Design a protein around this ligand. Structure first.
Ligand SMILES: [Mg+2]
Ligand SMILES: [Mg+2]
Ligand SMILES: [Mg+2]
Ligand SMILES: [Mg+2]
Ligand SMILES: [Mg+2]
Ligand SMILES: [Mg+2]
Ligand SMILES: [Mg+2]
Ligand SMILES: [Mg+2]
Ligand SMILES: [Mg+2]
Ligand SMILES: [Mg+2]
Ligand SMILES: [Mg+2]
Ligand SMILES: [Mg+2]
Ligand SMILES: [Mg+2]
Ligand SMILES: [Mg+2]
Ligand SMILES: [Mg+2]
Ligand SMILES: [Mg+2]
Ligand SMILES: [Zn+2]
Lengths: 171, 141, 174, 130, 66, 37, 66
RNA sequence: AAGUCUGGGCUAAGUGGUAAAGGAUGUGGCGCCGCGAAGACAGCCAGGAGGUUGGCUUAGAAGCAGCCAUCCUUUAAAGAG
């Protein structure tokens, strides 16, 4: 649900140097702060592959401090398919725009016939307060031939939440 | 096989294969992909050779995405002529592909099937490739 | 998972003597010297011989298993001894002993006569079973093999020399 | 590590329902002779307990971790454990020990048995139903 | 031809080409007129002459009794 | 013996062996024998 | 399962069983079948003996009314 | 002409000292899953059985021609193969 990941500070160390030694250069920020950091590459991957940009990672800083953050952006090295840098958004109590998973609670009538349900949205953008961050967002999918579909306007929307996309958006 | 419905220009300078892809470097549609390991002009006939192999392996089933398009006209002079007397004739179309580009994606199909089908597709392409699956990293993009 | 470290029982009364790069195994049925890597330790314990190796590197692991079996085979050789049986199959095909020698009639123009190497005994209990016996195992395996090659088992008919226990697999003629 | 423990509880549950659970070597029979002993130790008692057939490894954990004497008769060899007190046995060990010592060469011999709570014995358990 | 309760008698070359003989029961030989043109692409032929009668397997021998 | 640049197991009984500097496939089924080359 | 033909409205099954029903039976009319061939089988029940006939039900294409 | 110099490592092809897709239990070193002293992997001694030829088919296809269906049973376990 909530993940921990050890993070450290950097100044002048070259990214290529860090990157060489198994560390992922990165940065943490929010309206109030902005700090150059790095986390260990393999430790991060273990976490990120569960977290994604969905759940809160919390950063155990050397100083003792413990920031609750969302991953905001992950740069890839195009040529090697690997992360070169991460952007850690430090959560406060203010609302925050974010991506929340969609779980399609159901089985298709269009599939099981002669079909393939391309689901165009794995998740959905959503204005929300950090103390109210979901895990799921449930989607009724009893009937969907090839090809009908829904547009997020028809989404359950828990208490605390607020669609951050035009409700004309296909899921 | 693919080519532009229309072009603003019939023929175009050869240009150059430097660099990793500008974009298209992450999975965006399916679950599995095939990424270019080397730069090359992939040709329309080559792409379709790959497409068809995939469809044959699925027995019509599943969905296939083709993420490169041949928009670059390939020129050739007639056999046995000398140099000069102007640029040759367009003999077909190619897509310029640089390493990191995801060329095809598959969806709605088992892991074994995406695997084999992407493997095979590779064998029709004149470059090294690697098969990939969707990650956190693609969704973050 | 291991053959190199397996201890080799040694019957009363066969005697294993050790030297550098050779072990002499003597028993009721004769004696064999067994060449052995200079790199393995052959160890004589009570009614048992062990073999040891000085590392876990690949070449050493290999010689280990090999070496114990090489010795275990010599040990068995001089007490029990080895034999192999060939079955002769087919309408005109019969074997016979001519003195020490084995005569095969297997559908050639001539008959085939086979002299035994030293350390090898041939028996023909019936005219369609031949038996090769001796202390040296690979020697036995070899003479047995040679013999079989004179007229290998046919692909289409139960015809030719057969290893006892060799299954008769056949394809359809026409 | 592993679903061998949703089997530790099985033979701990249905061994926590006895005091005279005997044990035999139920193997050498075909599938005809299998449903022989099976419906005939199901017809020489109550419920449906002939043997439960479970690992000598696990069954010795059960007989050790529920005190039950540790039925150290002979856990080695094929072991099926004729739960004679998940049925109603008594001289129904005759109903087994003779039907086995009839069909085929030594059909279903025994090795362990707890008498009410105290250990029985080897052939003093074939003679305990004669 | 073995799907029509047939027994092969032999095969010999011809105009190259190649011919086959078999004892097929007539009772399984209706379709074989067109069924032959369907396998050889209108390039094979046949002749068909009676030879003998015999006792059919008891499966039909006690099924045709109807 | 098949002789190819691509030697592969053809069936679950096939076996990839390396003798004397060459890779062979060897098998119950004689059609499956391969040598690289 | 010879007996299941004289109790559903069928001489044959339903070609492709599952979606296509060409007859039916109740939870009590599966138990009655479970009755006649009960001395044949293995299990000596009727909640067990009938699920063997509630499965030779889709082995042809007849639903069991519940 | 000047080191058969020093230390760590790899290579067994004379690779070094002629090339690609691709193939591979070559070798050495990483990483990640799975199983394992409640006994795994390898061999080997059992068992792998019922309703049942499953139905429809075809001349016969009885687990295995081919369309279908694929339930349950006694079970430690056993596919309508
Ligand atoms: Mg990745
Ligand atoms: Mg990585
Ligand atoms: Mg140019
Ligand atoms: Mg972009
Ligand atoms: Mg070209
Ligand atoms: Mg022209
Ligand atoms: Mg030109
Ligand atoms: Mg290629
Ligand atoms: Mg010997
Ligand atoms: Mg020879
Ligand atoms: Mg072999
Ligand atoms: Mg000099
Ligand atoms: Mg030197
Ligand atoms: Mg050289
Ligand atoms: Mg060279
Ligand atoms: Mg390697
Ligand atoms: Zn093979």
């Amino acid at each position: 649900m909530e993940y921990r990941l050890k993070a450290y500070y950097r100044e002048g160390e070259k990214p290529s140097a860090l990157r060489r030694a198994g560390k992922l250069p990165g940065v943490m920020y929010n309206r109030h702060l902005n700090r150059k950091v790095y986390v260990d590459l393999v430790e991060f991957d273990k976490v990120f592959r569960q977290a994604s940009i969905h759940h809160v990672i919390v950063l155990e800083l050397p100083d003792g401090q413990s920031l609750p953050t969302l991953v905001r952006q992950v740069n890839l090295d195009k040529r090697r398919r690997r992360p070169e840098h991460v952007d850690f958004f430090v959560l406060s109590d203010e609302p925050v725009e974010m991506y929340v998973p969609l779980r399609f609670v159901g089985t298709p009538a269009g599939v099981r016939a002669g079909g393939v349900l391309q689901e165009i949205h794995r998740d959905i953008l959503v204005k929300v307060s950090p103390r109210n961050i979901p895990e799921f967002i449930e989607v009724d999918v009893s009937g969907l031939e090839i090809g009908d579909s829904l547009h997020a306007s028809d989404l359950k929307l828990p208490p605390g939440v607020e669609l951050a996309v035009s409700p004309e958006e296909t899921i | 096989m693919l080519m532009p419905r229309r072009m603003k220009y019939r023929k175009q300078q050869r240009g150059r294969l430097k660099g990793a892809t500008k974009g298209g470097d992450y999975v965006a549609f399916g679950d599995y992909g095939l990424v270019a390991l080397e730069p090359a002009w992939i040709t329309a006939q080559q792409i379709e050779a790959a497409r068809v192999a995939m469809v044959r392996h699925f027995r019509r089933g599943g969905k296939i995405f083709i993420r490169i398009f041949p928009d670059k006209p390939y020129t050739k002079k007639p056999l046995e002529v000398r140099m000069g007397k102007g640029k040759g004739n367009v003999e077909g179309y190619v897509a310029v592909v640089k390493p990191g580009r995801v060329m095809f994606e598959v969806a709605g199909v088992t892991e074994e099937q995406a695997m084999e089908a992407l493997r095979i597709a590779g064998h029709k392409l004149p470059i090294k490739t690697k098969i990939v699956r969707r990650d956190a990293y693609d969704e973050a993009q | 998972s291991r053959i190199g470290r397996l201890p080799i029982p040694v019957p009363k009364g066969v005697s294993v003597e050790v030297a550098p790069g050779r072990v002499k195994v003597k028993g009721p049925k004769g004696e064999l010297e067994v060449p052995v890597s200079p790199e393995m330790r052959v160890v004589v314990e009570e009614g048992v011989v062990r073999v040891e190796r000085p590392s876990d590197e690949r070449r050493h692991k290999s010689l280990h298993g090999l070496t114990r079996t090489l010795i275990a085979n010599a040990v068995k050789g001089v007490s029990e001894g080895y034999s192999k049986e060939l079955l002769i199959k087919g309408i005109g095909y019969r074997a016979r002993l001519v003195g020490r020698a084995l005569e095969l009639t297997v559908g050639f123009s001539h008959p085939v006569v086979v002299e035994p190497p030293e350390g090898i005994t041939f028996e023909v209990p019936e005219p369609t079973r031949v038996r090769v016996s001796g202390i040296d195992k690979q020697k036995v395996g070899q003479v047995a093999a040679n013999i079989r090659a004179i007229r290998k088992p046919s692909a289409y008919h139960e015809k030719g020399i057969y290893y006892a226990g060799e299954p008769v697999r056949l394809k359809p003629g026409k | 590590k592993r679903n061998v423990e949703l089997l530790a509880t099985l033979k701990e549950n249905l061994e926590r329902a006895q005091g005279s659970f005997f044990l035999v070597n139920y193997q050498g029979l075909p599938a005809k002779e299998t449903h022989a002993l099976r419906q005939a130790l199901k017809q020489n008692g109550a419920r449906l307990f002939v043997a439960k057939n479970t690992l000598i490894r696990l069954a010795l954990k059960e007989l050790g971790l529920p005190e039950l004497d540790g039925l150290q008769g002979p856990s080695a060899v094929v072991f099926y454990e004729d739960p004679v007190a998940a049925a109603k046995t008594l001289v129904q060990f005759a109903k087994s020990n003779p039907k086995g010592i009839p069909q085929v060469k030594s059909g279903l011999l025994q090795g362990q048995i707890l008498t009410a709570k105290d250990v029985e014995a080897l052939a003093e358990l074939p003679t305990m139903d004669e | 031809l073995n799907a029509r309760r047939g027994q092969i008698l032999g095969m010999e070359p011809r105009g190259n080409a190649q011919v086959i003989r078999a004892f097929v029961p007539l009772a399984e030989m209706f379709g074989y007129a067109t069924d032959l043109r369907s396998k050889t692409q209108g390039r094979g032929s046949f002749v068909m002459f009676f030879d003998h009668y015999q006792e059919v397997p008891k499966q039909v021998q006690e099924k045709l009794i109807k | 013996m098949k002789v190819r640049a691509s030697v592969k197991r053809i069936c679950d009984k096939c076996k990839v062996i390396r003798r004397h500097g060459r890779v062979y496939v060897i098998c119950e089924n004689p059609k499956h024998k391969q040598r690289q080359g | 399962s010879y007996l299941i033909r004289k109790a559903a409205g069928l001489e044959k099954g339903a070609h492709k069983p599952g979606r296509e029903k060409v007859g039916r039976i109740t939870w009590e009319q599966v138990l009655e079948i479970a009755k006649q061939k009960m001395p044949d089988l293995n299990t000596t029940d009727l909640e067990a003996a009938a699920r063997m006939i509630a499965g030779s039900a889709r082995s042809m294409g007849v639903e069991v009314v519940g």
